[PDB]
Amino acid sequence: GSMEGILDFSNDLDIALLDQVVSTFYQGEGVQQKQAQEILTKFQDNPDAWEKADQILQFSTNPQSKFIALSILDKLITRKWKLLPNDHRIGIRNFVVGMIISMCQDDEVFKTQKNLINKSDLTLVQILKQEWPQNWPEFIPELIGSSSSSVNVCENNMIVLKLLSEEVFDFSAEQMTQAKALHLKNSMSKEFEQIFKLCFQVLEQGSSSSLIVATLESLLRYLHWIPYRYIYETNILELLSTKFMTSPDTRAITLKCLTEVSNLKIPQDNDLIKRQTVLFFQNTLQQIATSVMPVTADLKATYANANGNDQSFLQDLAMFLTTYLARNRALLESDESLRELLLNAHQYLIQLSKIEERELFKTTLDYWHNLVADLFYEPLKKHIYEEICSQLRLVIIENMVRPEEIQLYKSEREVLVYLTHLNVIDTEEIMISKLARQIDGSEWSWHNINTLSWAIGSISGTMSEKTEKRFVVTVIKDLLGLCEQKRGKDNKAVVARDIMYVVGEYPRFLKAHWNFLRTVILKLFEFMHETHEGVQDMACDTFIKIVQKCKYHFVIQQPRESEPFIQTIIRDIQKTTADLQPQQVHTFYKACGIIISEERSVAERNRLLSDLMQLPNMAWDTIVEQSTANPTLLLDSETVKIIANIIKTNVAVCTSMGADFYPQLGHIYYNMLQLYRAVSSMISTQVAAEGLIATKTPKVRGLRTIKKEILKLVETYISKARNLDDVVKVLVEPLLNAVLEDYMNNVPDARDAEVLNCMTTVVEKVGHMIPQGVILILQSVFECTLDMINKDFTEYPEHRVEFYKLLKVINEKSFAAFLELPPAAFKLFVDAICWAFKHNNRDVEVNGLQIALDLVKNIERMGNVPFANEFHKNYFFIFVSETFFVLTDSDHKSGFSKQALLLMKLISLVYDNKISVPLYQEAEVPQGTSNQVYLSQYLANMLSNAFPHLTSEQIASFLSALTKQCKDLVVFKGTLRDFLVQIKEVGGDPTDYLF
Amino acid sequence: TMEEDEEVLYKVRAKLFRFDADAKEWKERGTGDCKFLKNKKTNKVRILMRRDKTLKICANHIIAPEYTLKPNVGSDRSWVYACTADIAEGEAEAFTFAIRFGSKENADKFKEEFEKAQEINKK
Amino acid sequence: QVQFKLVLVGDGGTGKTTFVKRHLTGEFEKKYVATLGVEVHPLVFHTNRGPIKFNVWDTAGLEKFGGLRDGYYIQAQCAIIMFDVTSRVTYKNVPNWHRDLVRVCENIPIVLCGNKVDIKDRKVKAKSIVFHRKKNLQYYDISAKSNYNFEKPFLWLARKLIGDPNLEFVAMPAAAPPEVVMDPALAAQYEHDLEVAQTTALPDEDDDL
């Protein structure tokens, strides 16, 4: 269209047309906006676009046009600056400097065009990275001079210096070579004396608030790197902690500065520097108390109202107090004149802690943890903070979260546990009185009673058994009162759940009083019958947790009890579980499994296991007889559901019983693998009959569930087995016959990835005992699974991940199985490993590089033999170059450390002379030549062809350094990162690699 | 909300899909409470479904007697039917919807309530 | 109408387009098609203070598709920085996305969003996520897939932009739907479409809903 004119560079640029296309993009809508976007992109991405930048900055009336012009300059400066003739470089420097001064002199432009001035300042800093100070020695003295002439220029120079400090110290690590980072750091360090002189003058001399803000913004950056003496041996602490706290425009930034000042490295043996650390804190708190709000202010109300920058300021206060007090509160604890300042600071944090902001609360809670842990272990400290600690008990108890939010709950539990140890009597009163408030009804609520319940649960284990006993009794008694008080099943259900939750959290009390424990379990069984699904699932979850804590009490015969209670539970299991859903029944059986595993008499456990599995075994036996009577009777989807649930019951019990499950696995094993084959045939038959769509039908998914749960049961047992001889002699051979051929001979979309997962666990635990078994596994799954995953990176994600898990464990435990492969199949193994390298899938990529490293290590073990010599000649350079491809293509940065590690290992083999034979073919290089010399020639050639903009000198220096550093990972990684920076630009300094 | 004129006959938790023709694939339109609302003025019953949290309407149409619930090949707990005019987006449009429920029970109950609403809408 | 420019930034793959599409249409796109430069979408929410409109500038995370890069941040009134809790490199790049953003937009409300919390194997743990504290960003664990906290970033930005912390999303009005008046001419066609829809399986059949 008309907007596409600017893309035609044969004609001079219509500056007025550019400004319209830019406005259509920023101010427009629909197809017009989208078309303007593709045109501006293609203009910007034109490699000659930089020639137009001078034109646009002089003549354009649209600040956004000028912004994008500087983006195009920024692109030229960072990537191709050194390719320009010196005349052009000085030219571009002059119209950037000229434009900045021009905009500063015009008060209207300086006020209204902040984006454009900030972009210009950043673009100047990109030039400083290239030229300063070698080709621009007097820049800093010039800049200091220009500052005195104009307030606007002075302020704008503080933004230049801020950005310069950011680029050199804060964000240099990634974007520059180590050598260039050091050069710029050193340059700013030498001239900082003069920079600080200006910054201190401006702050001390004062006037324009914007200037003071911009100056204080720059100081925040300097505080990351400057020596401490600039803060401590000047008047600057008095100015930050007094003057700049009173005025609100400088308050935000000054407080951020003082936070960073607390983190400055300081001698611990200097009494003056200590008084100065105390003084600036005293000053800052004094200014808050008089100029913002007193200690008694309701910061909760203030934050919630959210006027101006109250929220960001209160956040910045929390960061300041916690940063300072975490490092320095010890200074305030000895001198009794400083006692009021210490407790005032802590009382500010108390008020901050009450603010209704999760992220702010987390920040304060981190500090409170630091403190209460200190009062727990540090001697003669706790008596100082007794009034702060009492307030904090209320704060934590009133903000207790549910156990599902682990990070916050565990943080809150740990603080409140510490606080309970420090004063068990105070915590008791607060919780009891809060419970009384619920009973009286003034604070009564579903959230309040629940939140109190979680708090009471959290502190379990901290009190003495005798104190706990009395406290628990009191809480249960009070909670039972609430039930009597509140009619309506909804209200009663809320407190009923809470009551059950509390008894769950106090196992020691249940261990002590058998009668109470017995009453609670029977009620849970009653609760399992309740029609409401919420009650049933609550009841089931409570039973498992109590069981986990008090399992030993169930298995033994209690005083005045006919039998062990586990025996009683199993009698009525049918009746008890009648109304529960499948997965709730599975939890029940898992719980019983936990108890049965406490009985250590082989006879009594095997009997309890047999009694427990009665119902599913009788259901299994009937379906085994009806199934083999006619396999057509397995077409019933109801029969498919009952089978799945029988298998899942076996998985649930096996999960908690591990090795102790073997007798029950014995009962079902041969018929279960028979069922696996029968289900397998139906799935293959159904696929042919209905097509690929069949695998999506409820019927086939039903059958595939049976197969996956069978594999899951076998996987679960073998992962926990003791008797590994029984695994090999009994379990492995029937399993491999049943799963391997079925896997291989199904179409891709009918192959269960759980087969690969199950095989991984088998090879993990007994791989070393079945060398023929591992050979059979490879042959069945290797070639056909690779074919599913080697066309793209996306299709069959589970197979992809489980495939490289299986190759990894085989390569670890049974490497011999790879030596027995035909040459063509071994070549596919190496192709498969390099294929893993190129994945963005983190699970696949990591495994890929690990297998490569473990493979090279396995080959090294074999020593000087034909297969290791043949391996290196065939595959050494494939690994070197494929590793280099993913290091340097910018799309696999997450794999960087393992890439470096693998590349380091390969280079080390050659320089340690562990490779016995020439890697080169004869008549490619002089006969006497070392692998060391041929490696550097191959790598030089490879990198030259891949990165033709690099010089021979750049590539030579890189390889010289890299090869020498093959035993030093941190430095080797440094040299690789230096290479990645240099390939992104032209004219990289070859001396950078001598760092 | 424009729901005060209406009585809630049936409420069930569901996920709604619309079939895209260009690509032969289902696309989620929303997840939340599916409601059968009988207008007290006209006695006409409509499906109204709102997304969780945003509360935006993903389904708004009359339970027309002509509409027929057809099972999905890959789900025993879903129904697929064609809607001639849905105003959830803004202007009345024709959609091929599929609606999936937590259980086969819910889907079977939905089918009975849908047919009850259809008989009401005939009068 | 009351409309605000929102820029959406973060590494490739983090879930920026997926998150926006989910809000626009309700769909969860499982395929990763990298955005080229930027995609601008109007997104309206109904509140107790009337409707609020976000012009969502969904930017490209991949360097090679970066387009105008920080050009997109000009005159933005608010922002979301996205990272992936299953990718440690995406959290490590948060300070770089923030630096670029605040150099253009000095004083705007910004949400930091940890996406893909639905995945069990979380690589960026809650403990490690502290960058938001000093830069005064609001943080939320989100999942575009499970819809966990998926309204929260927009609700918080709405509250800051209108300057009312009591602002709530509300149920949009639901007009009476029209009578069908089915025509037999298109009856044949609708039937064909219905036949095809039945034969295509609904995605995520093993999901809870």
Ligand SMILES: Nc1nc2c(ncn2[C@@H]2O[C@H](COP(=O)(O)OP(=O)(O)OP(=O)(O)O)[C@@H](O)[C@H]2O)c(=O)[nH]1
């Ligand atoms: N499990 C899971 N996957 C998600 C989630 N959100 C997005 N994804 C998937 O992750 C990928 C993210 O793709 P996009 O949303 O296009 O990525 P983007 O951040 O816009 O990428 P660029 O445009 O390259 O910057 C897709 O495969 C999504 O389906 C989530 O919450 N959970």
Ligand SMILES: *C[C@H]1C(=O)[C@]23[C@H](O)[C@H]1CC[C@H]2[C@@]12CO[C@]3(O)[C@@H](O)[C@@H]1C(C)(C)CC[C@@H]2O
């Ligand atoms: C940053 C500027 C500034 O504040 C100055 C100059 O313009 C420049 C550096 C030195 C400052 C002065 C001179 O004029 C100023 O505008 C003003 O702030 C200072 C006064 C107070 C006038 C005198 C001291 C210093 O020389």
Ligand SMILES: *C[C@H]1C(=O)[C@]23[C@H](O)[C@H]1CC[C@H]2[C@@]12CO[C@]3(O)[C@@H](O)[C@@H]1C(C)(C)CC[C@@H]2O
């Ligand atoms: C508050 C409810 C509750 O928790 C009860 C009842 O369901 C109801 C009133 C009394 C409670 C019990 C009886 O069953 C409960 O569920 C249980 O929590 C109480 C036990 C511990 C079983 C015994 C005392 C009281 O009768």
Ligand SMILES: *C[C@H]1C(=O)[C@]23[C@H](O)[C@H]1CC[C@H]2[C@@]12CO[C@]3(O)[C@@H](O)[C@@H]1C(C)(C)CC[C@@H]2O
């Ligand atoms: C990376 C290897 C290498 O280049 C080494 C060693 O073989 C191994 C680590 C250290 C290197 C040396 C020692 O012998 C090397 O072959 C040789 O390249 C290095 C010299 C030059 C001898 C001295 C530094 C280092 O110790």
Ligand SMILES: [Cl-]
């Ligand atoms: Cl601008």
Ligand SMILES: [Cl-]
């Ligand atoms: Cl000094």
Ligand SMILES: [Cl-]
């Ligand atoms: Cl025990």
Ligand SMILES: [Cl-]
């Ligand atoms: Cl050279």
Ligand SMILES: [Mg+2]
């Ligand atoms: Mg995108």
